[PDB]
């Protein structure tokens, strides 16, 4: 099988700058690499065919290059709308194969997360559940580490973390962190805290409430 | 123009079976080879199967060979994928694509994708919980509210606030699996001087179970 190794899987690029995306084949491909762009809601769309040909309605800011085992997709300059997943693929040999994909993001200025914390609703409690929720909103860059503390003690059991993709409006990220408990345990502790570590602070960013 | 529309997705038990359909129009169907390609939740595109214009040359990916069968009904301009002996790993968004762009063969046109989930978890509507600042959050100009969507299956659920009226400021987080059920949350930001005096409601719909829930956000 012709293995396609695509790197990086994640790439951030400032608007105005050059985006470069590499796809190396495990064996020779003869002008049979194609590239696909996949925007969030949608199906992949053909971007480049035959290594360097642009498809219908593809901006000339997109160019493809390469030969043999080395191909590239190059977007110069990145614009806001180039935010997408990009996939190389070879139509040279069965089985047809794809690269693992690259997620292109916009590089912007650092932004500290805005943190809100939420006690379980009275409606969840009355059913016997007790999820505590922390929103960490509109931050950049995407790497962030969240810890939960209960009465000051770290707790990683029952923790659910989820990141949105880059926000189209401000190019920031947001993530949600949920500590899932039972009411009977929740009722036995006083204080709940989510703490995050992010590029924007030397100290962890904290957010706490006391059960009542 | 060229049009490809799929259906037949849904939830299936492991070892189970299912058939996907891909309708074509706006081209001469019987003159093009066709592909099925899939995309797992995480992740990447994976080629599944190929069938030539007259159904004579058929090709399969190694992981599906002997379990899946690809076919077409040319008079009815429809491409099919018969899936059997389903594995957890077959969970994916399935796309059909035309083999066009002659003489530089390429998957030039793709259908919208139809979702297949393979597991023994059953269809369950979510619970929906309003979130609900502090006891009631004084100060800040902006206030952030939330919606917790819990214990549902399978994916997906869709989230709106005030039925779509509140769209900007909304973050809806991708689902996470825990105890074999999904959970997600959604956040919205509204003006502090107008809440709660103007109501805010998260609406949640769950296609699989045909369920719809509205939940007003009360202070407390």
Domain ranges of chain A: 1-108, 109-211
Instruction: Give the residue carrying structure tokens 């059997």.
Output: B84
CATH architecture assignment, domain A1-108 = Sandwich (2.60)
Cα–Cα distance for residue pair B61/B46, rounded to 1 Å: 9
**H/E run at residue A185:** helix A183-186
What determination technique applies here? X-ray
Q: What is the dihedral of CA A123, B180, A40, A86, to 10 degrees?
A: 150
Burial class (CB in 10 A: 0-12, 13-18, 19+), B26: exposed
Nearest to B86 by CA among B163, B27, B18, B166: B18
Instruction: Give the residue carrying structure tokens 């969840």.
Output: A124
Instruction: Give the residue carrying structure tokens 């956000």.
Output: B217
B75: CB partners within 8 A, 6+ apart: none
Nearest chain A Cα to B179, which residue?
A158
- What's chain A's Rg over C-alpha atoms? 22
CA distance B131 to chain A (A): 6
- Say yes or no: B148 contacts chain A, CB-CB below 8 A: yes
Confirm if B80 and B22 have CB atoms less than 8 A apart. yes
Confirm if B117 and B13 have CB atoms less than 8 A apart. no
Three-state secondary structure of chain B: CCEEEEECCEEECCCCCEEEEEEEECCCHHHCEEEEEEEECCEEEEEEEEECCCCCCEEECCCCCCCEEEEEEHHHCEEEEEECCCCHHHCEEEEEEEEECCCCCEEEEECCCEEEEECCCCCECCEEEEECCCCCCCCCCEEEEEEEEEEEECCCCEEEEHHHCECCCCEECCCEEECCEEEEEEEEEEEHHHCCCCCCEEEEEEHHHCEEEEEECCCC
Cα–Cα distance for residue pair B73/B90, rounded to 1 Å: 24
Residues in B 62-101 with any Cβ partner in A closer than 8 A:
62, 95, 101
Q: SS3 helix, strand, coil % of chain A, rounded to 5?
A: 5, 55, 40
User: Cβ separation of B112 and A49 shorter than 8 Å?
Assistant: no
Peptide bond preceding B11 in cis form (omega within 30 of 0): no
Cα–Cα distance for residue pair A41/A43, rounded to 1 Å: 7
**H/E run at residue A174:** strand A173-182
Confirm if A89 and A21 have CB atoms less than 8 A apart. no
CATH architecture assignment, domain B1-121 = Sandwich (2.60)
Out of 2.60.40.10, 3.40.109.10, 3.40.50.1980, 3.40.50.2000, the CATH code matching B122-220 is 2.60.40.10
Q: What is the dihedral of CA A180, A163, B138, A193, to 10 degrees?
A: 40
Q: From the list A122, A135, A162, which residue is nearest B174 (CB)?
A: A162
Six token digits for residue B213: 């829930």
The DSSP output letter for A124 is H
Six token digits for residue B177: 């699996």
Other Cβ atoms within 10 Å of A40 Cβ, number: 10
Nearest chain B Cα to A95, which residue?
B61
Backbone φ/ψ region at B162: left (φ over 0), alpha (ψ -120 to 50), beta: left
Chain B residues in contact with A43 by the CB 8 A cut-off are: 95, 110-113
Superfamily of domain A109-211: Immunoglobulins (2.60.40.10)
Cα–Cα distance for residue pair A118/A114, rounded to 1 Å: 14
> Most B CBs within 10 Å: which of A30, A54, A178, as the mutation test of the B interface?
A178
The DSSP output letter for A137 is E
- Say yes or no: B140 contacts chain A, CB-CB below 8 A: no
Instruction: Give the residue carrying structure tokens 């949640």.
Output: B204
Cα–Cα distance for residue pair A74/A62, rounded to 1 Å: 6
The DSSP output letter for A91 is -
Six token digits for residue B49: 């199967």
Nearest chain B Cα to A163, which residue?
B173
**H/E run at residue A73:** strand A62-76
Six token digits for residue B47: 């080629």
Instruction: Give the residue carrying structure tokens 């849904």.
Output: B10
Six token digits for residue B30: 């019987």
Nearest chain A Cα to B187, which residue?
A135
User: Cβ separation of A131 and B175 shorter than 8 Å?
Assistant: no
Cα–Cα distance for residue pair B74/B130, rounded to 1 Å: 51
Helix and strand numbers (H, E) in chain A are 2, 18
Cα–Cα distance for residue pair B89/B23, rounded to 1 Å: 26
What's the reported resolution, in angstroms, to a tenth? 2.3
Cα–Cα distance for residue pair B217/B131, rounded to 1 Å: 7
Cα–Cα distance for residue pair A126/B101, rounded to 1 Å: 60
Q: From the list B101, B110, B146, which residue is nearest A118 (CB)?
A: B146
Other Cβ atoms within 10 Å of A23 Cβ, number: 27
Confirm if A132 and A155 have CB atoms less than 8 A apart. no
Going A106 to A111 to A113 to A114, the CA torsion angle's sign is: negative
User: Cβ separation of B127 and A94 shorter than 8 Å?
Assistant: no
Nearest to B202 by CA among B187, B191, B182, B181: B187
Residues in B 114-133 with any Cβ partner in A closer than 8 A:
127, 129-133
Nearest to A123 by CA among B218, B3, B99: B218
Confirm if A117 and A110 have CB atoms less than 8 A apart. no
Intervals of CATH 2.60.40.10 along chain B? 1-121, 122-220
Nearest to A78 by CA among A131, A173, A11, A147: A11
SS3 A186: helix
From residue B85, how far is each of A4, A123, B144 by CA, in Å? 28, 42, 47
Other Cβ atoms within 10 Å of A126 Cβ, number: 10
Going B91 to B97 to B99 to B105, the CA torsion angle's sign is: negative
Confirm if A167 and A174 have CB atoms less than 8 A apart. yes
B184: CB partners within 8 A, 6+ apart: A162, A176, B149, B157, B159, B172, B173, B174, B175, B176
Confirm if B186 and B101 have CB atoms less than 8 A apart. no
> Most A CBs within 10 Å: which of B131, B151, B220, as the mutation test of the A interface?
B131
Cα–Cα distance for residue pair B159/A22, rounded to 1 Å: 36
């Amino acid at each position: 099988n012709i293995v396609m190794t695509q790197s990086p899987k994640s790439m951030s690029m400032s608007v105005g700058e050059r985006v470069t995306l590499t796809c190396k084949a495990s064996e020779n491909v003869v002008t049979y690499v194609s590239w696909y762009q996949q925007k969030p809601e949608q199906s992949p769309k053909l971007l480049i065919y035959g290594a360097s040909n642009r498809y219908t309605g593809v901006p000339d800011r997109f160019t493809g290059s390469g030969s043999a085992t080395d191909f590239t997709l190059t977007i110069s300059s990145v614009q806001a709308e180039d935010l997408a997943d990009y996939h190389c693929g070879q139509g040279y040999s069965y089985p047809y194969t794809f690269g693992g994909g690259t997620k292109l993001e916009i590089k912007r200025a650092d932004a500290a997360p805005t943190v809100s914390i939420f006690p379980p609703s009275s409606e969840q409690l009355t059913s016997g559940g007790a999820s505590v929720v922390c929103f960490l909103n509109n931050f950049y860059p995407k790497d962030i580490n969240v810890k939960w503390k209960i009465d000051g003690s770290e707790r990683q059991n029952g923790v659910l973390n989820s990141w949105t993709d880059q926000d189209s409006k401000d190019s920031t990220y947001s993530m949600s962190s949920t500590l899932t408990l039972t009411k009977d345990e929740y009722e036995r502790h006083n204080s709940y805290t989510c703490e995050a570590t992010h590029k924007t602070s030397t100290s962890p960013i904290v957010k706490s409430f006391n059960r009542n | 123009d060229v049009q490809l529309v799929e259906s037949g997705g849904g939830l299936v038990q492991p070892g189970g079976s299912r058939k996907l359909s891909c309708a074509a129009s706006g081209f001469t169907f019987s003159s093009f080879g066709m592909h099925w390609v899939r995309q797992a939740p995480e992740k990447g595109l994976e080629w599944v199967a190929y069938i030539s214009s007259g159904s004579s040359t058929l090709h399969y990916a190694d992981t599906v060979k002997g379990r899946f069968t690809i076919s077409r009904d040319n008079p009815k301009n429809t491409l099919f994928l018969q899936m059997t002996s389903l594995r957890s790993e077959d969970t994916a968004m399935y796309y059909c694509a035309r083999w066009g762009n002659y003489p530089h063969y390429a998957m030039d046109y793709w259908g919208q994708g139809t979702s297949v989930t393979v597991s023994s978890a059953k269809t369950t509507a979510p619970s929906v919980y309003p979130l609900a600042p502090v006891c009631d959050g004084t100060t800040g100009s902006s206030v952030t509210l939330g919606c917790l969507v819990k214990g549902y299956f399978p994916e997906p659920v869709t989230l709106t606030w005030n039925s779509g009226s509140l769209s900007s400021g909304v973050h809806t987080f991708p689902a996470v699996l825990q105890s074999d059920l999904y959970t997600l949350s959604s956040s919205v930001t509204v003006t502090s001087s107008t809440w709660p005096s103007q109501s805010i409601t998260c609406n949640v719909a769950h296609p699989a179970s045909s369920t719809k829930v509205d939940k007003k956000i009360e202070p407390r």
